[PDB]
């Protein structure tokens, strides 16, 4: 009996899926720690007889041995049915299971919240974006005793950082479809939106670029905006933003919405400003002098080796396996 | 973004050497930052064509175009399974390293019909790692035309078992099964023979029960000689394969006795790791005649050579060189 | 481009547990991609001041601004060396993790506390064996704000674990010159002492010759109980540290018996790894009574818990968390 | 007797030093393989007394033990005296020594030939020699180098994850080296533009675009947009520039003779040309499809350079050969 740690990893999604991006990046760190990938392909679950699905899963977990530990990165995006039966398959082994939450599907839409929580409760440790997320999940019946807070996505990279000049512009590499505040841009601060989609005056569309390029370009100065839409104001209070990690790894300060999860990280480390609303953000971008920009930048760049070396991830990947056995 | 993947069987008996080698190789591959494609040993005919195909899709779900895959063959799931795994792999734009642990039609007179199908699927790899040059030669004669070949040379035996000081015990160690090795029963000499096995034999042969490898290593290190031998039934294969027993003796820290004609025998010759003997009589005779002086030297050569074995360097180099060859012309 | 380095001592006797520890932490560290800053144990007074300085420049030659350095203390080259290594480290723009294996000023050695504390305080993060250790260190002026608790030693190993039978015997792989209760051993339960010392022992102590750790693990895994016991003058200083042999028993796969108030005692209780006893006499009683099933369970707890020990997870978490903390 | 592998690595040179860049790249690969760094700092050896030197060295190798293997990246650039002395220290341990040659000082010009005997003497204490090219090994043998086990490096790697942009057929030649070292640049006289990436002040001939020095990753991204990489100058060693071009994902043009050119030919990675004028011709005549093919070749071969495989093999093979 010789313990190995395995971790699930999705494959086959779009060139531009942040979801897969997250998992693959977590997995690369995990591989570097000695862990083993359980590759999972993103496909149409209805395409399998319930029996072919049982055996595709046997294919996926073929290397598993009792005494192992499995880190399940949820969701698989293969349907709650897949999630459920993957879990069920793992519960047949005499192993500890770490549930690593990237998103809670119902949070839209809301109905399957119950079957979601239900297989969640089968894990031994839960890793979640924030304590607020854990608290809110307990409210729906989540009863796993050992929980670990993720805090922040890393963003492992060796993209050169150029000196950050005080450009009074704002960067935002999300998609307008999901963020409608972007179409409502009123202010005379340029908003640089990085997206594939083609949809005001001061918003400037920029072509989707490989992540390393975006980082290099963003490092030349400016501010990074982390901002949700108005129903997404639920999550935001709960999830970890991926682009937040991308701003910080690039070496520029951030502007986040008052009430975002884990805001303490931003404050304690002097990484940017927590503002009430867009207006206040604009104001600060207009007010900030050369001095206080130079400070925020140096704060970001003394902080970001954590992000670029993948330590929030190495941290939770190590602690959760230990808590599972301990 | 190229990743390197390696297949690894699972599910066989704890006593199975085939799985033991594959796991060990995998353990070394993982340390090199490679990725496991786990494969479970089961009865292939409990699947419909659709199900087997989808079990394979599950096994290879993480592969992408541009990756490299090392197929550790055989899977012991049948030539049929090997062939369809290979077929799946060829749908990807990847390079395939075929790493041969055994050639199943060459190792049993009755498995020979499978030669042609085995070769056909061998010829789909970009690189073949074979135990010996002689095995590659033999493969060629049966139609194997894979242009790039790497010689494995020897099985490592990664470990940290204590090595005790080796005294000149005039005994011979043999951790194999009497079934696969019938000569055991016809043991007739007055030099003791220790047979380590889970399984009925002559007076000068002592049966010791199957221990976990680590303990076997510690015990063997106390001295004596490791015998690497095969019956005349397998004299053919012997000139071709790599013995795992060989690597276990040397890792333990004792000299070995091997039959003339065995694969990669110059390895033993040039590193002074034991004796190449014509027959069992010549070995028994050398064990009775060797003096303290000579045994001292042999043990010295073995324990200066065997860091390679214990740190997995034969495996590290084939794992590194084969992936390199798969890409570079 | 940040690298993590970790100090590691070399040159001590194959018997030195202090080196065995640093070396083990270092091995885990290297598997995590950290880099060794090798330190050799020698007579410091053989060095002129400038020689000592440049020997140190030799040790840290590979360091760069922006690196993170883990200092496993002490080096055993004496405090003067520890202090001079720390100052050398502070000359770089790096974050420093202090990893405490022992604290020298802890009775007549106490006078050294001022110097010891003054260099501890140059660290950004302190990893200490127990919270208790951290508290005592605070009473004497340690003010490093980020601290991590180690909570056990690991024992990474591949040692076969045999099935464990209930044997009413106690294993103690400790030097009997350092533990006196051994010479006083007066009980009908056999005490098995694994030691290099060529001396004879009380009637019911079985002197067993020193053996490679791997062999010791395998042998102990056949059953019996592992005793973690301190002398008497090492009693206060006891409560503080992490027992290395404790880790060895659990990694072998047998339950343990430890004195009341041992550092990180709750780990034993919360995981069902053995018993906390007042004194030897209670320990003898438990071993006399303890039944077959109750033992079976003790073992089950141990072997479900010990893959953490055997794969080095206490160390992996402290090496990972302390670096994170040094930057955060 | 637990064998560990160590590798020397220089530190403390300028950010522009290719020697350091190389030793550091090899070392990072070595660390991923589990090998341990012996960090060496570049200073002025005259500032040490004999005793101080001996103890600085003792500080550098404090972690070695009998039974280890040591890979010595030579030269250290602290001089031959330092290299000889480091080699002397190592020999005092019962270890095997791999000598990995980056440069041979006494072969740099005839003036430095007097150093050959000292150089060869200490080379000969090694158990294995890794050299850039077989040709180099042959030359060394002519001067008394007698280490029986040798390994050929072939090519520098270039570990990176720089995005590769699509390679447009730009009729331009990239050359990230400095002028004060390459005469041919100041003499440029072709209607084909030469993109020279340098930190130097100097203004440059008409059809040269002096581009400011830039981080390696950025350089790689820019070059991946297309055009040709030029390797120009001692066909003894491996060009580091070469690996940068191929990692960036564009084909190369190299001067006839240089070492290991059959790597170029056998993988269809560029052109081996007699002179500069031959290079301008091929850049003028080459058509769209011929160029898509070059790029195909380079981008299929690339992953070796980018994942550090020339280095992984020499680091694995040489340690193996040191014991076997
Ligand atoms: O041109 C682009 C724009 C987006 N991104 C990536 O997409 C991320 C943001 O995606 P998403 O909005 O889904 O992250 P979220 O903040 O919502 O968690 C950025 O940080 C980048 O990593 C990118 O690689 N190139
Ligand atoms: O008591 C035993 C006897 C055998 N072995 C293992 O079984 C191997 C021999 O198996 P096999 O005879 O199949 O090796 P090969 O024929 O390839 O030389 C030995 O080297 C050991 O590693 C073991 O672990 N415990
Ligand atoms: O025959 C022996 C006896 C001791 N030890 C090692 O020495 C440790 C105990 O040493 P020490 O008492 O110094 O550690 P402590 O428990 O006091 O921290 C054991 O756990 C073993 O790992 C060993 O390897 N072989
Ligand atoms: O703007 C620049 C110019 C050059 N270089 C680096 O310098 C290398 C060339 O160095 P050198 O000419 O010394 O190498 P050589 O080809 O002579 O071996 C390039 O490959 C780059 O990696 C760079 O990073 N940025």
Determine the atom of ligand 2 nearest the C-alpha atom of B177.
12
CB atoms within 10 A of CB C309: 25
**Same structural domain, C166 and C240:** yes
Residue range(s) defining the domain that contains residue B15: 1-156+312-329
Query: Are residues D152 and D136 in contact, defined by beta-carbon separation less than 8 angstroms?
Result: no
Q: What's chain C's length in residues?
A: 328
Query: Are residues A238 and A132 in contact, defined by beta-carbon separation less than 8 angstroms?
Result: yes
From the CA atom positions of chain A, what is the Rg in Å? 21
Which residue do the tokens 């899977």 mark?
Answer: B75
Query: Can you list the positions of beta strands (E) in chain A?
Result: 5-11, 36-41, 69-74, 96-101, 125-128, 146-149, 165-172, 191-195, 203-207, 221-226, 254-257, 272-275
Q: What are phi and psi of D33, to 5 degrees?
A: -80, 0
Q: Please work out whether the CB of residue A261 comes within 6 Å of at least one atom of ligand 1.
A: no
**Same structural domain, B70 and B172:** no
Query: Are residues A37 and B62 in contact, defined by beta-carbon separation less than 8 angstroms?
Result: yes
Cβ–Cβ gap A59/B62 under 8 Å: no
Tell whether D34 is within 8 A of chain B (Cβ): yes
Cα distance between residue C41 and residue A94, in whole Å:
46
C89 vs chain D: nearest CA distance in angstroms?
A: 15
Angstrom distances, CA of residue B120 to CA of B106, B109, B141, B240, D146:
15, 19, 13, 20, 46
Angstrom distances, CA of residue D245 to CA of A158, B329, D156:
19, 18, 11
Please indicate if the annotation marks B211 as binding a ligand: yes
Tell whether D89 is within 8 A of chain C (Cβ): no
Enter the tokens of residue A160.
């050169």
A300 vs chain B: nearest CA distance in angstroms?
A: 29
Cα distance between residue D301 and residue B2, in whole Å:
11
Return all residues near D113 (Cβ < 8 A) that are at least 6 apart. D106, D107
Please indicate if the annotation marks A243 as binding a ligand: yes
Query: C89: closest CA among C112, C63, C114, C125?
Result: C63
- In chain B, the residue whose alpha carbon lies closest to the alpha carbon of D321 is B308
Give the CATH number, domain containing residue B176. 3.40.50.2000
Cβ–Cβ gap A55/B59 under 8 Å: no
Please indicate if the annotation marks D239 as binding a ligand: yes
> Which of A28, A34, A208, A210 would best serve as a mutation to test chain D binding (most D beta carbons within 10 A)?
A210
CB atoms within 10 A of CB A200: 10
Enter the tokens of residue A28.
């690369």
Q: Which residues in B lie closer than 8 A to residue A40 (C-beta atoms)?
A: 61-62
Cα distance between residue A121 and residue A113, in whole Å:
12
Q: What are phi and psi of C310, to 5 degrees?
A: -75, -20
Determine the number of helices (DSSP H) and then strands (DSSP E) in chain B.
13, 12
Query: Can you list the positions of beta strands (E) in A67-164?
Result: 69-74, 96-101, 125-128, 146-149
Tell whether B30 is within 8 A of chain C (Cβ): no
Cα distance between residue C135 and residue B163, in whole Å:
44
A306 vs chain C: nearest CA distance in angstroms?
A: 7
Question: Does residue C96 sit in helix, strand or coil?
Answer: strand
Query: Are residues A215 and A157 in contact, defined by beta-carbon separation less than 8 angstroms?
Result: yes
Determine the atom of ligand 1 nearest the C-alpha atom of A19.
13
Q: How many CA atoms lie less than 13 Å away from B301 in the CB half-sphere? A: 17
Which residue do the tokens 């390895």 mark?
Answer: B267
Q: What's chain D's length in residues?
A: 324
Cα distance between residue C311 and residue D4, in whole Å:
19
Q: Please work out whether the CB of residue B142 comes within 6 Å of at least one atom of ligand 2.
A: no
Cα distance between residue B260 and residue B82, in whole Å:
33
- In chain B, the residue whose alpha carbon lies closest to the alpha carbon of C219 is B215
- In chain B, the largest separation of any two C-alpha atoms, in whole Å, equals 65
**Same structural domain, A305 and A316:** no
Q: Between A1, A269, A319, which is nearest C317 by CB?
A: A319
C207 vs chain A: nearest CA distance in angstroms?
A: 32
Distance from residue B310's CA to the centre of ligand 2 (Å)? 16
Distance from residue D180's CA to the centre of ligand 4 (Å)? 14
**Same structural domain, A82 and A187:** no
Return all residues near D285 (Cβ < 8 A) that are at least 6 apart. none
Q: Please work out whether the CB of residue D226 comes within 6 Å of at least one atom of ligand 4.
A: no
Q: Which residues in A lie closer than 8 A to residue B76 (C-beta atoms)?
A: none
Please indicate if the annotation marks A18 as binding a ligand: yes
Nearest ligand, CA C152: 3
Angstrom distances, CA of residue D278 to CA of C117, D176, D209:
71, 20, 21
Angstrom distances, CA of residue B289 to CA of B170, B274, B292:
10, 14, 10
Cβ–Cβ gap A52/B56 under 8 Å: no
End-to-end CA distance of chain C: 17
**Same structural domain, B60 and B196:** no
Tell whether A97 is within 8 A of chain D (Cβ): no
**Same structural domain, D302 and D244:** yes
Cα distance between residue C181 and residue C171, in whole Å:
14
**Same structural domain, C254 and C318:** no
Query: B51: closest CA among B84, B75, B25?
Result: B84
Which residue do the tokens 């004669």 mark?
Answer: B141
Q: Please work out whether the CB of residue C24 comes within 6 Å of at least one atom of ligand 3.
A: no
Q: Number of folded domains in chain C? A: 2
Return all residues near C204 (Cβ < 8 A) that are at least 6 apart. C185, C186, C187, C188, C189, C190, C191
Query: Are residues A130 and A238 in contact, defined by beta-carbon separation less than 8 angstroms?
Result: yes
Cα distance between residue B169 and residue B171, in whole Å:
5
Cα distance between residue C152 and residue A325, in whole Å:
14
**Same structural domain, D288 and D315:** no
Nearest ligand, CA D156: 4
**Same structural domain, B30 and B148:** yes
Tell whether A322 is within 8 A of chain C (Cβ): yes
Paired residues of A163 in beta bridges: none
Angstrom distances, CA of residue D119 to CA of A52, D74, D93:
67, 10, 21
Q: How, if at all, do strands B148-151 and B95-100 pair?
A: unpaired
Enter the tokens of residue C323.
């670096």
Q: Please work out whether the CB of residue C245 comes within 6 Å of at least one atom of ligand 3.
A: yes
Angstrom distances, CA of residue A312 to CA of A178, A318, B148, C205, C259:
27, 10, 43, 51, 38
| Dihedral sign from CA coordinates of B213, B217, B220, B225 | positive
Angstrom distances, CA of residue D4 to CA of A254, B33, D9:
45, 19, 16
CB atoms within 10 A of CB D193: 17
Cβ–Cβ gap B211/C159 under 8 Å: no
**Same structural domain, B250 and B172:** yes
CA angle B290, B295, B296 (to 5 degrees): 145
Q: Which residues in B lie closer than 8 A to residue D34 (C-beta atoms)?
A: 31
CB atoms within 10 A of CB B130: 28
Cβ–Cβ gap C327/A306 under 8 Å: yes
Cβ–Cβ gap C214/B215 under 8 Å: no
Stated as kind and residue range, the H or E segment containing B251 is: helix B244-252
Query: Are residues B131 and B107 in contact, defined by beta-carbon separation less than 8 angstroms?
Result: no
Enter the tokens of residue B8.
């690894």
The DSSP call for residue A236 is G
Determine the number of helices (DSSP H) and then strands (DSSP E) in chain A.
12, 12
Return all residues near C231 (Cβ < 8 A) that are at least 6 apart. C178, C179, C180, C181
Enter the tokens of residue C180.
């006196």
Angstrom distances, CA of residue D165 to CA of C328, D46, D220, D247:
36, 49, 10, 12
Cα distance between residue B133 and residue D215, in whole Å:
47
Q: Which residues in B lie closer than 8 A to residue C159 (C-beta atoms)?
A: 214
DSSP string, C111-129: GGHHHHHHHHTT-SEEEES
**Same structural domain, D318 and D302:** no
**Same structural domain, B1 and B150:** yes
Query: Can you list the positions of beta strands (E) in C200-326?
Result: 205-209, 225-228, 256-259, 274-277
Cβ–Cβ gap A40/B61 under 8 Å: yes
A308 vs chain C: nearest CA distance in angstroms?
A: 9
Sequence-distant contacts of C54-57: CB under 8 A, at least 24 apart: C54/D48, C54/D52, C54/D55, C54/D56, C54/D59, C55/D55, C55/D56, C55/D58, C55/D59, C56/C84, C56/C85, C56/C88, C56/D59, C57/C88, C57/D41, C57/D56, C57/D59
The DSSP call for residue A176 is T
Cα distance between residue C265 and residue C278, in whole Å:
13
Q: Between C31, C317, C327, which is nearest A34 by CB?
A: C31
Paired residues of A99 in beta bridges: A72, A126
Angstrom distances, CA of residue A15 to CA of A12, A20, A211, B32, D156:
9, 9, 11, 27, 31
Tell whether B148 is within 8 A of chain D (Cβ): no
Q: Which residue from A13, A173, A307 has its CB within 8 A of the most atoms of ligand 1, so it is best to mutate?
A: A173
Cα distance between residue B72 and residue B69, in whole Å:
9
Angstrom distances, CA of residue C89 to CA of C1, C56, C93:
18, 10, 8
D254 vs chain C: nearest CA distance in angstroms?
A: 33
Stated as kind and residue range, the H or E segment containing D273 is: strand D270-273
Enter the tokens of residue C65.
């601004």
Query: A56: closest CA among A68, A43, A73?
Result: A43
Residue nearest to atom 6 of ligand 3 (CA): C213
Tell whether D319 is within 8 A of chain B (Cβ): yes
Cα distance between residue D197 and residue C211, in whole Å:
63
In the sheet that holds B167-174, the strands lie side by side as B205-209, B193-197, B167-174, B223-228, B256-259, B274-277
Cβ–Cβ gap A160/D218 under 8 Å: yes
Please indicate if the annotation marks C17 as binding a ligand: yes
Query: Are residues A133 and A261 in contact, defined by beta-carbon separation less than 8 angstroms?
Result: yes
Residue D93 Cα to chain centre, angstroms: 29
């Amino acid at each position: 009996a010789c313990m190995r740690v395995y971790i699930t990893n999705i494959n086959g999604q779009s060139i531009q899926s942040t979801a897969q991006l997250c998992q693959n990046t977590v997995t690369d760190v995990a591989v570097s720690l000695g862990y083993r990938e359980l590759g999972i392909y993103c496909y149409q679950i209805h395409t399998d007889s319930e029996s072919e699905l049982s055996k595709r899963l046997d294919g996926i977990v073929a290397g598993l041995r009792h005494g192992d530990v499995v880190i399940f990165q949820t969701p698989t995006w293969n349907t709650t049915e897949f999630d459920e039966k993957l879990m069920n398959k793992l519960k047949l082994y005499d192993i500890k299971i770490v549930l690593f939450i990237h998103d809670v599907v119902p949070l839209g839409n809301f109905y399957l919240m119950d079957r979601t929580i239900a297989y969640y409760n089968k894990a031994d440790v839960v890793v979640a974006p924030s304590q607020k997320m854990i608290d809110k999940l307990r409210d729906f019946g989540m009863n796993v005793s050992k929980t670990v807070v993720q805090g922040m996505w890393d963003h492992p990279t060796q993209a050169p950082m150029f000196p950050a000049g005080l450009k009074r512009e704002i960067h935002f590499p999300g998609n307008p479809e999901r963020f409608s505040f972007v179409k409502e841009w009123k202010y005379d601060i340029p908003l640089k939106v990085y997206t594939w989609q083609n949809v005001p005056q001061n918003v400037h569309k920029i072509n989707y670029r490989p992540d390393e390029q975006l980082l290099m370009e963003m490092s030349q100065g400016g501010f990074g905006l982390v901002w949700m839409d108005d129903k997404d104001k639920e999550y935001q209070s709960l999830y970890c933003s991926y682009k937040l990690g991308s701003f910080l790894a690039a070496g520029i300060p951030v502007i986040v919405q008052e009430g975002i999860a884990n805001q303490e990280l931003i404050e304690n480390n002097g990484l940017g400003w927590i503002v009430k609303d867009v207006e206040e953000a604009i104001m600060k971008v207009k007010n900030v002098n050369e001095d206080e920009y130079i400070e925020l930048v140096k704060n970001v760049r003394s902080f970001n080796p954590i992000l670029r070396k993948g330590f929030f991830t190495r941290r939770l990947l190590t602690e959760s396996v230990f808590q599972a056995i301990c």
